[PDB]
Structure 1
Amino acid sequence: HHHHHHMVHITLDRNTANSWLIISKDRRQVRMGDTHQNVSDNKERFSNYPMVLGAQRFSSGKMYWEVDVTQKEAWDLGVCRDSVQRKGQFSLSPENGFWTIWLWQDSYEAGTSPQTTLHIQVPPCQIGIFVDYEAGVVSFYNITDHGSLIYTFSECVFAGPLRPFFNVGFNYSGGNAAPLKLCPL
Protein backbone atom coordinates (compact mmCIF):
# COMPACT_ATOMS: atom_id res chain seq x y z
CA HIS A 1 0.00 0.00 0.00
CA HIS A 2 0.94 3.73 -0.43
CA HIS A 3 -1.25 5.20 2.47
CA HIS A 4 1.78 6.07 4.75
CA HIS A 5 1.65 9.86 3.80
CA HIS A 6 -1.84 10.16 5.52
CA MET A 7 -0.08 9.25 8.84
CA VAL A 8 -1.71 10.90 11.90
CA HIS A 9 -0.27 11.09 15.48
CA ILE A 10 -2.79 9.24 17.67
CA THR A 11 -2.85 9.57 21.50
CA LEU A 12 -5.03 7.63 23.95
CA ASP A 13 -7.86 9.31 25.91
CA ARG A 14 -7.45 8.31 29.64
CA ASN A 15 -11.06 9.35 30.40
CA THR A 16 -12.48 6.65 28.08
CA ALA A 17 -10.28 3.83 29.44
CA ASN A 18 -11.61 0.88 31.41
CA SER A 19 -10.53 1.43 35.05
CA TRP A 20 -7.98 -1.48 34.93
CA LEU A 21 -5.96 0.00 32.06
CA ILE A 22 -2.55 1.69 32.46
CA ILE A 23 -1.78 4.32 29.80
CA SER A 24 1.84 5.50 29.48
CA LYS A 25 2.86 9.14 30.22
CA ASP A 26 3.23 9.83 26.43
CA ARG A 27 -0.37 8.46 25.92
CA ARG A 28 1.03 6.13 23.18
CA GLN A 29 0.95 2.75 25.04
CA VAL A 30 -1.75 0.88 27.00
CA ARG A 31 -1.73 -2.39 28.96
CA MET A 32 -3.97 -4.34 31.39
CA GLY A 33 -3.23 -3.43 35.07
CA ASP A 34 -3.23 -6.09 37.90
CA THR A 35 -6.21 -4.46 39.68
CA HIS A 36 -8.39 -1.34 39.44
CA GLN A 37 -6.07 1.60 38.70
CA ASN A 38 -7.57 3.95 41.36
CA VAL A 39 -9.47 6.30 39.00
CA SER A 40 -13.02 7.69 39.49
CA ASP A 41 -15.86 6.25 37.35
CA ASN A 42 -17.44 8.36 34.55
CA LYS A 43 -19.98 7.83 31.76
CA GLU A 44 -17.20 7.64 29.06
CA ARG A 45 -15.35 4.56 30.49
CA PHE A 46 -15.84 1.17 28.85
CA SER A 47 -17.10 -0.88 31.89
CA ASN A 48 -17.13 -4.55 30.73
CA TYR A 49 -14.00 -4.89 28.52
CA PRO A 50 -10.38 -3.61 28.51
CA MET A 51 -11.14 -0.92 25.87
CA VAL A 52 -9.97 2.68 25.31
CA LEU A 53 -10.42 5.32 22.56
CA GLY A 54 -7.98 7.64 20.83
CA ALA A 55 -8.42 11.36 21.66
CA GLN A 56 -8.60 12.33 17.96
CA ARG A 57 -12.02 12.65 16.20
CA PHE A 58 -12.25 12.31 12.41
CA SER A 59 -15.23 13.54 10.31
CA SER A 60 -13.49 13.91 6.85
CA GLY A 61 -10.31 12.96 4.94
CA LYS A 62 -7.89 10.10 4.85
CA MET A 63 -6.08 8.93 8.03
CA TYR A 64 -3.45 6.20 8.65
CA TRP A 65 -1.80 4.91 11.84
CA GLU A 66 0.09 1.77 13.05
CA VAL A 67 -0.22 -0.32 16.20
CA ASP A 68 2.33 -2.78 17.68
CA VAL A 69 0.71 -6.08 18.89
CA THR A 70 3.97 -8.04 19.58
CA GLN A 71 3.53 -11.16 21.76
CA LYS A 72 -0.20 -10.62 22.46
CA GLU A 73 -2.66 -13.53 22.42
CA ALA A 74 -5.85 -11.41 22.14
CA TRP A 75 -6.78 -7.81 21.08
CA ASP A 76 -9.27 -5.82 19.00
CA LEU A 77 -8.26 -2.84 16.78
CA GLY A 78 -9.98 -0.41 14.44
CA VAL A 79 -12.30 2.64 14.63
CA CYS A 80 -15.67 3.34 16.10
CA ARG A 81 -18.35 6.02 16.26
CA ASP A 82 -17.89 8.59 19.02
CA SER A 83 -21.42 7.59 20.27
CA VAL A 84 -20.82 3.81 20.77
CA GLN A 85 -22.27 2.20 23.93
CA ARG A 86 -19.74 2.25 26.85
CA LYS A 87 -21.62 0.24 29.57
CA GLY A 88 -22.70 -3.41 29.62
CA GLN A 89 -22.32 -6.19 27.07
CA PHE A 90 -22.23 -5.61 23.29
CA SER A 91 -20.75 -7.17 20.11
CA LEU A 92 -18.26 -5.42 17.83
CA SER A 93 -20.20 -4.89 14.58
CA PRO A 94 -20.85 -2.08 12.08
CA GLU A 95 -24.52 -2.09 13.27
CA ASN A 96 -23.19 -1.14 16.77
CA GLY A 97 -20.75 1.48 15.35
CA PHE A 98 -17.48 -0.53 15.17
CA TRP A 99 -15.12 -1.33 12.25
CA THR A 100 -12.58 -3.72 13.79
CA ILE A 101 -10.44 -6.88 13.43
CA TRP A 102 -9.21 -9.09 16.25
CA LEU A 103 -6.99 -11.94 17.36
CA TRP A 104 -8.60 -14.58 19.59
CA GLN A 105 -7.59 -18.24 20.25
CA ASP A 106 -4.96 -18.38 17.53
CA SER A 107 -7.34 -17.05 14.73
CA TYR A 108 -7.83 -13.59 13.18
CA GLU A 109 -11.39 -12.38 12.38
CA ALA A 110 -13.06 -9.19 11.09
CA GLY A 111 -15.86 -7.78 13.30
CA THR A 112 -18.71 -8.21 10.82
CA SER A 113 -22.03 -9.75 12.01
CA PRO A 114 -21.49 -12.61 11.94
CA GLN A 115 -17.64 -12.42 12.09
CA THR A 116 -15.47 -13.15 9.03
CA THR A 117 -12.42 -15.45 9.01
CA LEU A 118 -9.17 -13.68 8.00
CA HIS A 119 -6.37 -15.47 6.03
CA ILE A 120 -2.99 -14.38 7.49
CA GLN A 121 0.12 -16.51 6.64
CA VAL A 122 2.57 -14.24 8.60
CA PRO A 123 1.24 -13.43 12.13
CA PRO A 124 1.52 -9.62 12.37
CA CYS A 125 3.63 -7.79 14.95
CA GLN A 126 2.36 -4.37 13.66
CA ILE A 127 -1.04 -3.52 12.05
CA GLY A 128 -1.68 -0.51 9.77
CA ILE A 129 -5.19 1.07 9.86
CA PHE A 130 -6.42 3.27 6.98
CA VAL A 131 -9.70 5.27 7.07
CA ASP A 132 -11.13 7.08 4.02
CA TYR A 133 -14.10 8.98 5.49
CA GLU A 134 -15.63 10.18 2.22
CA ALA A 135 -15.26 6.80 0.48
CA GLY A 136 -16.68 4.84 3.48
CA VAL A 137 -13.58 2.54 3.75
CA VAL A 138 -11.63 1.07 6.66
CA SER A 139 -8.64 -1.12 5.69
CA PHE A 140 -6.13 -3.15 7.72
CA TYR A 141 -2.56 -3.95 6.60
CA ASN A 142 0.06 -6.49 7.84
CA ILE A 143 3.22 -4.30 8.32
CA THR A 144 5.30 -7.49 9.22
CA ASP A 145 4.41 -8.92 5.73
CA HIS A 146 5.46 -5.89 3.56
CA GLY A 147 2.08 -4.15 4.09
CA SER A 148 -0.13 -6.96 2.66
CA LEU A 149 -3.93 -6.38 2.90
CA ILE A 150 -5.71 -8.09 5.80
CA TYR A 151 -9.29 -6.80 5.39
CA THR A 152 -11.35 -3.94 3.82
CA PHE A 153 -14.72 -2.78 5.16
CA SER A 154 -16.39 -0.92 2.29
CA GLU A 155 -19.81 0.77 2.01
CA CYS A 156 -19.29 1.86 5.62
CA VAL A 157 -22.08 3.98 7.14
CA PHE A 158 -20.02 5.88 9.81
CA ALA A 159 -23.05 8.05 10.80
CA GLY A 160 -20.90 10.28 13.07
CA PRO A 161 -17.39 11.31 14.04
CA LEU A 162 -14.91 8.38 14.25
CA ARG A 163 -12.39 7.62 17.01
CA PRO A 164 -9.44 5.17 17.02
CA PHE A 165 -10.52 2.06 18.98
CA PHE A 166 -8.37 -0.37 21.06
CA ASN A 167 -8.95 -3.47 23.21
CA VAL A 168 -5.85 -4.91 24.99
CA GLY A 169 -7.87 -8.09 25.86
CA PHE A 170 -8.14 -9.96 29.12
CA ASN A 171 -5.18 -11.75 30.64
CA TYR A 172 -6.78 -14.88 32.17
CA SER A 173 -3.95 -17.03 30.59
CA GLY A 174 -0.98 -15.00 31.95
CA GLY A 175 0.23 -14.83 28.30
CA ASN A 176 -1.52 -11.57 27.23
CA ALA A 177 0.03 -8.89 29.53
CA ALA A 178 1.96 -7.14 26.71
CA PRO A 179 0.83 -3.61 25.71
CA LEU A 180 -0.66 -2.16 22.54
CA LYS A 181 1.74 0.56 21.33
CA LEU A 182 1.17 3.34 18.77
CA CYS A 183 4.23 3.13 16.46
CA PRO A 184 6.18 6.23 15.44
CA LEU A 185 5.63 7.96 12.06
Structure 2
Amino acid sequence: HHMVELTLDPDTANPRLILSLDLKGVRLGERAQDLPNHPCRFDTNTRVLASCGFSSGRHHWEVEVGSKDGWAFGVARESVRRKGLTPFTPEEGVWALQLNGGQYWAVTSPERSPLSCGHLSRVRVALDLEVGAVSFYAVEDMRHLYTFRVNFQERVFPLFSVCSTGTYLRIWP
Protein backbone atom coordinates (compact mmCIF):
# COMPACT_ATOMS: atom_id res chain seq x y z
CA HIS A 1 0.00 0.00 0.00
CA HIS A 2 1.67 3.22 -1.41
CA MET A 3 1.41 5.93 1.35
CA VAL A 4 3.31 9.28 1.54
CA GLU A 5 6.26 9.69 4.01
CA LEU A 6 5.37 12.68 6.28
CA THR A 7 7.54 14.46 8.92
CA LEU A 8 6.21 17.08 11.39
CA ASP A 9 7.48 20.66 10.52
CA PRO A 10 9.21 22.06 13.64
CA ASP A 11 8.81 25.65 12.26
CA THR A 12 4.97 25.22 12.59
CA ALA A 13 4.88 23.45 16.01
CA ASN A 14 3.40 25.26 19.01
CA PRO A 15 6.30 25.74 21.50
CA ARG A 16 4.67 23.42 24.12
CA LEU A 17 4.43 20.50 21.63
CA ILE A 18 7.12 17.75 22.00
CA LEU A 19 8.03 16.21 18.59
CA SER A 20 9.90 12.84 18.45
CA LEU A 21 13.42 12.74 16.86
CA ASP A 22 12.03 10.83 13.78
CA LEU A 23 9.49 13.75 13.38
CA LYS A 24 6.60 11.16 13.42
CA GLY A 25 5.25 11.61 16.98
CA VAL A 26 3.65 14.56 18.82
CA ARG A 27 2.82 14.99 22.58
CA LEU A 28 1.94 18.15 24.54
CA GLY A 29 4.63 19.20 27.12
CA GLU A 30 4.08 21.15 30.43
CA ARG A 31 6.46 23.98 29.46
CA ALA A 32 6.85 26.04 26.26
CA GLN A 33 10.26 25.60 24.62
CA ASP A 34 12.09 28.93 24.03
CA LEU A 35 11.87 28.77 20.18
CA PRO A 36 12.32 31.69 17.75
CA ASN A 37 8.86 32.74 16.43
CA HIS A 38 8.39 31.97 12.71
CA PRO A 39 5.44 33.32 10.62
CA CYS A 40 4.33 29.64 10.18
CA ARG A 41 4.47 28.73 13.95
CA PHE A 42 1.10 28.20 15.72
CA ASP A 43 1.88 30.51 18.69
CA THR A 44 -1.37 29.81 20.71
CA ASN A 45 -3.28 26.77 19.32
CA THR A 46 -1.52 23.41 20.12
CA ARG A 47 -1.00 22.40 16.45
CA VAL A 48 1.67 21.34 13.94
CA LEU A 49 1.55 20.42 10.21
CA ALA A 50 3.68 17.95 8.20
CA SER A 51 6.33 19.87 6.14
CA CYS A 52 4.56 18.50 2.98
CA GLY A 53 1.68 20.61 1.52
CA PHE A 54 -0.46 19.19 -1.38
CA SER A 55 -1.44 20.99 -4.66
CA SER A 56 -2.97 17.95 -6.59
CA GLY A 57 -3.72 14.17 -6.71
CA ARG A 58 -4.65 11.41 -4.15
CA HIS A 59 -2.43 10.78 -1.00
CA HIS A 60 -2.85 8.29 1.90
CA TRP A 61 -1.23 8.08 5.35
CA GLU A 62 -2.09 6.63 8.77
CA VAL A 63 -2.27 8.20 12.27
CA GLU A 64 -1.92 6.12 15.46
CA VAL A 65 -3.86 7.78 18.33
CA GLY A 66 -3.73 7.65 22.15
CA SER A 67 -6.71 6.33 24.14
CA LYS A 68 -6.82 9.44 26.45
CA ASP A 69 -8.67 12.68 25.39
CA GLY A 70 -6.73 15.57 23.82
CA TRP A 71 -5.97 14.96 20.14
CA ALA A 72 -7.35 16.18 16.80
CA PHE A 73 -5.88 15.40 13.34
CA GLY A 74 -6.74 15.79 9.66
CA VAL A 75 -5.77 18.37 6.98
CA ALA A 76 -5.67 22.20 6.89
CA ARG A 77 -5.62 24.74 4.03
CA GLU A 78 -2.23 26.49 3.81
CA SER A 79 -3.83 29.89 4.85
CA VAL A 80 -4.91 28.33 8.19
CA ARG A 81 -4.13 31.14 10.72
CA ARG A 82 -1.12 30.60 13.11
CA LYS A 83 -1.22 33.84 15.24
CA GLY A 84 -3.41 34.21 18.37
CA LEU A 85 -6.34 32.06 19.51
CA THR A 86 -8.18 30.85 16.34
CA PRO A 87 -11.36 28.71 16.11
CA PHE A 88 -10.85 24.96 15.27
CA THR A 89 -13.57 24.75 12.55
CA PRO A 90 -14.05 24.05 8.78
CA GLU A 91 -14.61 27.83 8.25
CA GLU A 92 -10.96 28.36 9.39
CA GLY A 93 -9.43 25.72 7.01
CA VAL A 94 -9.46 22.76 9.47
CA TRP A 95 -11.09 19.36 8.66
CA ALA A 96 -10.35 16.97 11.55
CA LEU A 97 -11.54 14.12 13.76
CA GLN A 98 -11.13 14.58 17.56
CA LEU A 99 -11.11 12.55 20.83
CA ASN A 100 -12.67 14.71 23.58
CA GLY A 101 -14.65 13.97 26.79
CA GLY A 102 -14.35 10.22 26.11
CA GLN A 103 -16.10 10.72 22.72
CA TYR A 104 -14.93 10.62 19.04
CA TRP A 105 -16.10 13.69 16.97
CA ALA A 106 -15.91 14.96 13.42
CA VAL A 107 -15.27 18.71 13.96
CA THR A 108 -18.26 20.18 12.12
CA SER A 109 -19.45 23.73 13.01
CA PRO A 110 -21.25 25.14 14.82
CA GLU A 111 -21.83 21.72 16.55
CA ARG A 112 -19.33 18.79 16.43
CA SER A 113 -20.75 15.49 14.97
CA PRO A 114 -20.49 12.55 17.42
CA LEU A 115 -19.11 9.38 15.68
CA SER A 116 -20.31 5.89 16.77
CA CYS A 117 -17.16 4.05 15.70
CA GLY A 118 -15.98 2.25 18.90
CA HIS A 119 -12.30 2.34 20.06
CA LEU A 120 -9.63 3.68 17.58
CA SER A 121 -5.87 2.82 17.62
CA ARG A 122 -4.97 3.81 14.01
CA VAL A 123 -6.81 5.73 11.20
CA ARG A 124 -6.09 5.88 7.43
CA VAL A 125 -6.51 9.40 5.91
CA ALA A 126 -7.26 9.55 2.11
CA LEU A 127 -6.82 13.09 0.67
CA ASP A 128 -8.37 13.46 -2.83
CA LEU A 129 -7.63 16.89 -4.41
CA GLU A 130 -9.01 15.68 -7.80
CA VAL A 131 -12.60 15.13 -6.47
CA GLY A 132 -12.22 17.40 -3.37
CA ALA A 133 -12.58 14.96 -0.37
CA VAL A 134 -10.74 13.85 2.76
CA SER A 135 -11.94 10.53 4.32
CA PHE A 136 -10.95 8.76 7.58
CA TYR A 137 -11.00 4.94 8.07
CA ALA A 138 -10.32 2.71 11.14
CA VAL A 139 -7.52 0.38 9.88
CA GLU A 140 -8.85 -2.73 11.83
CA ASP A 141 -11.73 -3.16 9.21
CA MET A 142 -11.25 0.03 7.10
CA ARG A 143 -14.69 1.16 8.49
CA HIS A 144 -15.73 4.66 7.28
CA LEU A 145 -15.56 7.26 10.11
CA TYR A 146 -16.30 10.58 8.22
CA THR A 147 -15.77 12.28 4.84
CA PHE A 148 -15.56 16.10 4.43
CA ARG A 149 -16.39 16.94 0.79
CA VAL A 150 -14.42 20.15 0.06
CA ASN A 151 -13.60 22.18 -3.06
CA PHE A 152 -9.96 22.79 -1.90
CA GLN A 153 -8.75 26.00 -3.63
CA GLU A 154 -5.23 26.19 -2.03
CA ARG A 155 -2.54 23.71 -0.85
CA VAL A 156 -3.73 21.16 1.77
CA PHE A 157 -1.44 20.12 4.70
CA PRO A 158 -1.74 17.20 7.15
CA LEU A 159 -2.64 18.71 10.61
CA PHE A 160 -2.11 17.51 14.25
CA SER A 161 -3.17 19.07 17.56
CA VAL A 162 -2.65 17.70 21.10
CA CYS A 163 -4.17 20.01 23.82
CA SER A 164 -3.73 17.58 26.81
CA THR A 165 -0.71 15.89 28.38
CA GLY A 166 -1.27 12.10 28.70
CA THR A 167 -2.03 11.51 24.94
CA TYR A 168 -0.26 11.36 21.53
CA LEU A 169 -0.47 11.20 17.71
CA ARG A 170 2.04 9.13 15.61
CA ILE A 171 2.35 9.31 11.77
CA TRP A 172 2.77 6.08 9.71
CA PRO A 173 4.69 5.25 7.64
Normalized against structure 2, the TM-score is what?
0.93
Unaligned runs of 5+ in 1: 172-176
Per-residue deviation at 1:93?
A: 2.3
Overall identity of the aligned pairs, in % = 39
Q: Secondary structure at the match of 2:11?
A: helix
Measured against aligned partners, the alpha-carbon deviations of 1:131-164 in whole angstroms (never above 9, x if no partner) come to 1001011100112x3111100111x022200110
Q: Which residue of 1 aligns with 2:170?
A: 181
The alignment status of 1:58 with 2:54, answered yes or no, reads: yes
Larger displacement relative to structure 2 (102-111 or 8-17): 102-111
- The answer for the alignment partner of 1:149 in structure 2 is 144
**Cα shift at 1:92:** 2.3
Unaligned runs of 5+ residues in structure 2 are none
For 1:62-110, what per-residue CA distance to the aligned partner results, in whole angstroms no more than 9, with x for missing partners?
Answer: 0111111133322111000111111222222222111111111011111
TM-score, with structure 1 as normaliser: 0.87
Deviation at 1:178, TM superposition (A): 3.3
Q: Tell me which residue corresponds to 1:174.
A: none
Let me know the Cα RMSD of the aligned residues. Answer: 1.4
Choose between structure 1 and 2: higher strand proportion.
Answer: 2
Q: Deviations over 1:4-55 (max 9, x none)?
A: 43x1111100000001112122111111122112212222111222110110
Q: How many residues align?
A: 172
CA distance in 2, matches of 1:93, 1:168: 16
Aligned 8 A contact 1:70 1:126 in 2: no
Once residues 179 and 169 of structure 1 are traced to their aligned partners in structure 2, the CA distance between those partners, rounded to angstroms, is 10
Q: What's 2:113 paired with?
A: 116
In the alignment, does 2:143 pair up with 1:160?
no
